[PDB]
Design an enzyme around this catalytic site. Structure first.
Site, PDB file in Angstrom:
ATOM      1  N   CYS A   1       0.908  -1.143   0.000  1.00 44.86           N
ATOM      2  CA  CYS A   1       0.000   0.000   0.000  1.00 44.86           C
ATOM      3  C   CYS A   1       0.943   1.187   0.000  1.00 44.86           C
ATOM      4  CB  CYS A   1      -0.881   0.050   1.249  1.00 44.86           C
ATOM      5  SG  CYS A   1      -1.912   1.556   1.306  1.00 44.86           S
TER       6      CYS A   1
ATOM      7  N   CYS B   1      -0.119   4.200   2.260  1.00 44.57           N
ATOM      8  CA  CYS B   1      -0.096   4.027   3.708  1.00 44.57           C
ATOM      9  C   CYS B   1       0.201   2.572   4.071  1.00 44.57           C
ATOM     10  CB  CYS B   1      -1.426   4.487   4.328  1.00 44.57           C
ATOM     11  SG  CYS B   1      -2.919   4.161   3.343  1.00 44.57           S
ATOM     12  N   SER B   2      -0.681   1.931   4.821  1.00 49.13           N
ATOM     13  CA  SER B   2      -0.442   0.542   5.185  1.00 49.13           C
ATOM     14  C   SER B   2      -1.719  -0.283   5.224  1.00 49.13           C
ATOM     15  CB  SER B   2       0.288   0.468   6.529  1.00 49.13           C
ATOM     16  OG  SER B   2      -0.317   1.326   7.475  1.00 49.13           O
ATOM     17  N   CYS B   3      -2.591  -0.050   4.246  1.00 48.33           N
ATOM     18  CA  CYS B   3      -3.841  -0.792   4.149  1.00 48.33           C
ATOM     19  C   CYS B   3      -3.466  -2.268   4.191  1.00 48.33           C
ATOM     20  CB  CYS B   3      -4.564  -0.417   2.854  1.00 48.33           C
ATOM     21  SG  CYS B   3      -5.125   1.312   2.890  1.00 48.33           S
TER      22      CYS B   3
END
Ligand SMILES: OC[C@H]1O[C@](O)(CO)[C@@H](O)[C@@H]1O
Ligand SMILES: OC[C@H]1O[C@](O)(CO)[C@@H](O)[C@@H]1O
Ligand SMILES: OC[C@H]1O[C@](O)(CO)[C@@H](O)[C@@H]1O
Ligand SMILES: OC[C@H]1O[C@](O)(CO)[C@@H](O)[C@@H]1O
Ligand SMILES: OC[C@H]1O[C@](O)(CO)[C@@H](O)[C@@H]1O
Ligand SMILES: OC[C@H]1O[C@](O)(CO)[C@@H](O)[C@@H]1O
Ligand SMILES: OC[C@H]1O[C@](O)(CO)[C@@H](O)[C@@H]1O
Lengths: 216, 152, 120, 152, 217, 118, 156, 217, 120, 151, 216, 119
Positions: free
Chosen positions: A105, A108-110
């Site tokens: 991602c 971000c950090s989905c």
């Protein structure tokens, strides 16, 4: 106590004081988080390896397939409408002799938390987010994974509401294995795609572990 | 070993001395901003895919108690309608600006932004937030403890 | 002072899910699986979830994943407009000039809302 | 004097080569943030009084047509109750963050913030702003002109 | 070519008008108002104060009331009828004396007494001036060519809230019998900021480099 | 959702901060008092410069009443407090200030909330 | 499109300039500010970069400048004729030049400067002769009489 | 458009000649020698090695002696008669095998086997290539479009002293019955450095960006 | 006053070559092929050609390449002492802590003068 | 102390001053302008006129080794190893931009004293490297180190 | 022990071992340095204030005048040809009601050691070397010194073999004072030019003192 | 290669530096009162004529002494000796921003003959 702990206390108390959410809600979410882990996703892969029809379902409708391992993306979370941040659109990416997936991602950090648990620290790093989409072969090699040059390496960037888990190809040397034995080698890293399942390996490759000042 | 550790510290240390043409920017005139710079300055901070970076030995990190509580707070705030996850991402991963975006910790931004939503949507006044921070500090100083972080 | 509706989202998504709760609200899709599309370099001021590395590149739509308000609207509390989201596959060589022909089949898959797509 | 111009150009240029221990920050862990850094990162950008700076030969600058139009727009928005000047200062001189605060021009921040208030208070959707920008660009390219900036 | 700033300026203005946040007339009216602003009224206030001890007392105690004498009503002169949104309605006049000399700055931004003095100088808005003046006033003033006795109290006024200041310097020697017009003529913008003092024969700010605009007003 | 007439209705024909006159009640301090600046949290916003924190000065004037900028900048005007113009000796702000210029000062305004008797 | 992609790649490179960092300028700090780690790093031999972390770059070829070919020949001829050995050259050229010049200037720029350096350091020419030759050479170019194979004389 | 480099080059060369350090003839002779250099001799040595197991053994054990077979005598071919001052006289040929693949670099600078291979590539001299290859060879090689089985030993040779290397790649499939010229033709400069492997039909280095000189040779 | 001998190197190496011209001047080698040696972290002030990345590491000598003055001396015009140079092979895993076990056979070969070696 | 934290803050924020930081990795000649050429080939010690900030000047106690270094440099000149000008050129210019401002004043004096011994061949670099090892071993073995450390 | 002390020892032993200079030479120099101080220069100023003829000599021939206070730039140093670094060309800069001098060495820290002692840490700083020549009025103000705008402030940059000491104007309130009394207020800082002599002040202005790791 | 470690001492003992070079520069090219401009000579490797003086014009106020130029002395070349001049510059001719209020401020420094040309 750090500045972060002082502010965390402040924010939480104010939110509760203003009736935004209750002390109970907070404990409820932490308890839910504690129920999460990579096993459900691993079991989905094992089940798919053992049932061609279920594998088809996984590829076409990850949300429906997830119910088979007890994780209903809509009703399992406390909200009863999916977690606010992971949503309800799981897609399962099926590797094959000519296709190998790896997920990131960049924004971000989905991560598919409901079925996979919390994200790895490195997965959230600007470094991994900058490089994987552009130099996947090189990054994967760093992780110790290499695939034939003709095999299609597909990087999935989960930039919207879809969350992914990778269904690796069943490795050799697992003939007659039970669902539990198969799931056991499908580690978190395998589900992310930075590693592939191997008989005898039942934990993520050892990596340096940065200690927390005050761990949970 | 001790030699190797010194070797590795050295390899990392010399990067601090990498030569560069360092141009400080002090509110330059509009005529100093090219379209390229305009796009770079007004960029959305979270959009880093494709940017060149170096190889680093990826590590796992132990979860801090305040990090778990921050995560819970942010999902609870969304769960109860204070905001949607997308509003959080925009405020947390973009509105914080370039400097804070990469200089502060991941969950540090989550926390700052959780405090931010309370103020921006006027559920609390900034004065209440400031006074609350004072309260937490005095609670610690007075030896009354701070939640699960410090026993009284 | 302004009043924020903190029950709207829950009333709408409970027992249904997100993005399931927006299903059917986008109307007819402008594109379909198999279509070749180029990514429009729309202004990205303040917010966007269509990565810069995809602008101006051409890819193939492999799936209509769901319907939802664009993040550009949802992130600012504007959910009155819903549009189709597509999963698009790009050849790595079309994104990165230096990508090696040795790895000719490598690709990248990501999702883009309809507003960023134009027939290729 | 050509030589003198080169001398002063030189004195300004060597500043770019001033040695330093340049430590890039890539989302460091909470354990890498001391209280001093926490305070510096969460600082309010506009508060610069007392910071050490060098002597500069102060200059005057002609007003750009767009700067005058931006000023009028910001005061009119306040005049008609879209915001108070204090809300503008907070969003314009602090919320923009450290990098934009000193990297972009004075009025560039005013303008970006005028656009911001329209979106944040939902008087326009971000989509309407993005669309209007596209229309303006097309207007310029079509030969239709652009207000008092470019005749058709 | 038009800049990204000009494209965005047009976008913002059109959207605001279209959504009815403010009218096309409001914008023209504000630009007209801005065009009438300048340092002349402030210079006259100083001249009148030098020529009238009672008015000077009024200036020092109630700047807002004193400002009316030079045609600048901080509440009703602006188009709002409640003062400009950004300059507010609390002007204070700082009176220099043989033992006190003032210089003004706004470390937080560029607050300026626009209604009575006009638009702020480019350097006044600079992070540099905002960083250094409050701490090294003697040095910065010397850079501007102004030096005062070491025993004299140099007071830096940081307009960080709703108050705006203008400096009333002491009347310089060599102006005996000068009329109001003659005295006002030597009270330049820079004198009203405090980076310079009035001098007979000097009726313009000290010449300094001028950065040209891509498309000037 | 947003009231765009409140400010104008309140300040027209009166001015700002005149429109807040009398809303702060009795002032906690008076001209002549020695006060020290409290180092209150400054997260997100403040108009009380960092360079003044912990410094002691002399109140020379009660300039007006008005909601603190910390509240006004976020649309919160329900509370109004007194603003004081305070004079600091330069040497009390900057350690390196020269005794040769012992009379130099700095004057700025701070709202009541940051003040405590010195 | 090509125009769009070019702007995209220009953007990806430009943002690197804005990468946040804790930039500590060094102005002749006291000995008490120098740790052993810093001491070893400052007294390092500049050419020893093997193992340092760096990013991927699209490697390119570069045409040889006429002055680079002449510089190469000059350096080998000086060694050929005993003015120095290649190792003396490497030490002076890739190390003695110091960190800043080592990475701030071009590869052959360092060869050339060092060729001039060896002439002065071993007193085959005084620094005065070098400075004077440069002044004359500049005049030669400015006057219009040309400069060897680099610039022909002005004609009609 | 003469650069500071061209001015200095002329200055240094004229001074050296005026002082009799080296002659104008020496300089012309070296430039002509360099002009005769290239990758053909090295490619020829590889081809001959592929076509004669006994010569291959010689190449592996005594690169200097084997080099004579392709017209390159490291001692007498150069104008000095004692080898080039910077490349020395100790060439070693690194033979790849089904279980071993070599790639060469000079982390300290750009040492290269000029006498038999020609001038070094711009990227070979780069700090980037010099920093990364020794530590992340797999990754750097992949960037060049080369990948080997994980079990194969990739050996990075760092020429940090007086030895210079050339890589003898494994002979590719699809070349049965090929003549010496046919084989030599597919052994490019890149193959000899190790960032690429010989392939039938490929007779030129992989195309990559070319940075133009201001005044090229 | 200083006079530099510009003919010494040529007279010594002409018709012989470098490093051939130093053959036999090092005497008997302290190490031989097959020996395991660790690289001593000798001071590197001003100059060295033994890369920092090899210090403290252990490798295997695979060849006695030639005899020659150490670069540390040659680079400063001191050629009175000549020593043996060895080509050493290091396992990549012994140099870089992060090297992957997947590429367990990768190595790095480089040359080092006798002064930097000690029995492993 | 609040004032202490205030002044610490004022100094710390300088680390975060925004800038366009362009790393230089052996740029091609076409990337070097005359302006850059002059800036790169400048003699490091020539700093007169460069813009700088005000700093509270301080005195500094003399380190024993600084005293010895000074005496060593003057003695080397006294005895004809070099003249002071040769020292200045090597010490304040030859060290280069990075070392010139990154290391301490007397640190450069010392490094240069060691340099002249090697450059004029009064000692080989090997003898210098060996002596350094000897000093370290002397300390490690507990034999002391001059007036810096007793046995 | 630091890396600096290790190297200092190495260099010193090597120099002595090679016979470049002797242990005695080193001791003799440290002893000479130890005797250096501002007193001689202070007395020179005091003498000039009381003797019009001597003042003229100071202004025209600093080297000759220096002998009158016991410092012979040629013979006092151990070499008997002047110190290698300070040379033998001292010049005395005489302030007046319309001229005030201040000294710096932008290229390094050239200082009149034989008659004044070792240079201050700040005098050697890149900061002082960059600023004084361009913003003298400002720098002096920082030091607490200010002069009339019409007075000529002259910065002397000691960039070659000449070293300077400043002869400030005699301050008021010193009538009848003896030579030693006058010399008492002529501090090191007055001789540099960053301060002027004042009755009652007999030491440099107090400023922060950075401590050494191993001083004395 | 041998370095003479006794030369300097033998030449300067009992005389001093730069006294030991007196008379070796011959007749000076310039004299007190002369207005001179500083030539921007190449500063490659070494120079003691600050960049801030290049191209500026000043007044010679004294012929301080004779000595080999630092540019030569620092590389061990002392065969040539030239005159050194002390030159006074008006601050406004060096720094564009210098204030007219301090119209009399100056800067004095020394420069060898090679850098000077009649203004
Ligand atoms: O940043 C530190 C990095 O550099 C080293 O110390 C040396 O190369 C590495 O092991 C580490 O990953
Ligand atoms: O300096 C960064 C500033 O911008 C934000 O992250 C977002 O508006 C603020 O809370 C902070 O004050
Ligand atoms: O409010 C923060 C604003 O300034 C920058 O800081 C941060 O990304 C802008 O993009 C944003 O709109
Ligand atoms: O930036 C322009 C100004 O700054 C300098 O380059 C360096 O101080 C000056 O010479 C010039 O006047
Ligand atoms: O060579 C430049 C290359 O690096 C970037 O600027 C940043 O990653 C790329 O877009 C471009 O292809
Ligand atoms: O040769 C000495 C010159 O070269 C450098 O060491 C490297 O460019 C410079 O700093 C110095 O002026
Ligand atoms: O107030 C700012 C403080 O920080 C410095 O500039 C640098 O450490 C100090 O000298 C000053 O006291």
């Amino acid at each position: 106590v750090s500045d972060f702990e002082i502010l965390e206390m402040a924010v939480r108390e104010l939110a509760i004081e203003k009736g935004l959410f209750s002390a109970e809600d907070h404990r409820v979410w932490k308890d839910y988080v504690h129920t999460l882990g990579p096993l459900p996703a691993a079991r989905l892969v094992a089940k798919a390896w053992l049932d061609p029809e279920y594998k088809k379902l996984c590829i076409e409708d990850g949300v429906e397939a997830s119910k088979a391992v007890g994780v209903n993306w809509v009703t399992s979370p406390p909200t009863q409408f999916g977690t606010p941040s992971d949503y309800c659109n799981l897609r399962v990416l099926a590797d094959s002799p000519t296709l190998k997936h790896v997920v990131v991602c960049t924004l971000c950090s989905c991560y598919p938390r409901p079925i996979l648990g919390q994200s790895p620290e490195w997965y959230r790093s600007p470094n991994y987010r900058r490089r994987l989409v552009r130099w996947p072969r090189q990054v994967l090699a760093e992780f110790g994974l290499q695939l034939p040059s003709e095999v299609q390496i597909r990087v999935a960037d989960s930039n919207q509401k879809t969350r992914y888990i990778v269904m690796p190809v069943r490795p050799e040397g697992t003939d007659g294995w039970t669902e539990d034995q198969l799931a056991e080698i499908v580690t978190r890293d395998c589900l992310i795609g930075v590693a592939v399942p191997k008989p005898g390996i039942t934990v993520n490759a050892k990596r340096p572990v940065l200690k927390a000042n005050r761990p949970v | 070993s001790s030699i190797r550790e010194e070797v590795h510290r050295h390899l990392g240390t010399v990067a601090l001395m990498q030569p560069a043409l360092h141009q400080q920017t002090h509110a330059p005139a509009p005529t100093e901003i090219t379209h390229t710079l305009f796009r770079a300055y007004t960029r959305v901070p979270h959009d880093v895919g494709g940017e060149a970076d170096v190889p680093i030995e990826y590590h796992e990190k132990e979860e801090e108690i305040w990090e778990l509580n921050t995560f819970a707070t942010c999902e609870c705030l969304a769960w109860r309608g204070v905001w949607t996850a997308e509003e959080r991402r925009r405020k947390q991963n973009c509105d914080v600006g370039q400097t804070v975006y990469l200089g502060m910790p991941y969950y540090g931004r989550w926390l700052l932004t959780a405090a931010r939503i309370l103020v921006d949507k006027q559920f609390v006044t900034l004065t209440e937030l400031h006074n609350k921070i004072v309260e937490m500090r005095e609670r610690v100083a007075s030896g009354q403890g701070l939640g699960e972080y410090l026993p009284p | 002072k302004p009043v924020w509706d903190r029950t709207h989202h829950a009333k709408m998504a409970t027992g249904i899910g997100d993005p399931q709760c927006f299903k059917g609200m986008a109307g007819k899709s402008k594109f379909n699986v198999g279509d070749r599309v180029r990514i429009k370099d729309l202004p990205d001021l303040f917010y966007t979830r269509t990565m810069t590395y995809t602008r101006g590149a051409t890819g193939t739509i492999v799936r209509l994943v769901y319907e939802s308000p664009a993040a550009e609207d949802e992130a600012f509390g504007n959910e009155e407009n819903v549009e189709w989201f597509y999963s698009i596959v790009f050849a790595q060589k079309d994104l990165w000039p230096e990508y090696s022909d040795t790895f000719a089949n490598d690709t990248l898959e990501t999702e883009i809302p309809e507003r960023y797509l134009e027939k290729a």
